[PDB]
Symmetry: C2
Subunit: 30 residues, 2 copies
Amino acid sequence: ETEKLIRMKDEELRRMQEMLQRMKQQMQDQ
Amino acid sequence: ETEKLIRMKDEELRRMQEMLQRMKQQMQDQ
């Protein structure tokens, strides 16, 4: 549980930072 | 200190989501 929870939230943080970088690259195209 | 980490990563997830919706409203301005 608690270890699995930490690993789940670490994966989500990675996904959201990846999504931030894609939105960053899309707003530079303007 | 697993419970302190879970709260830290929950705080990070919240800030990155505010930032994503903040970047979203900036791309809706284009």
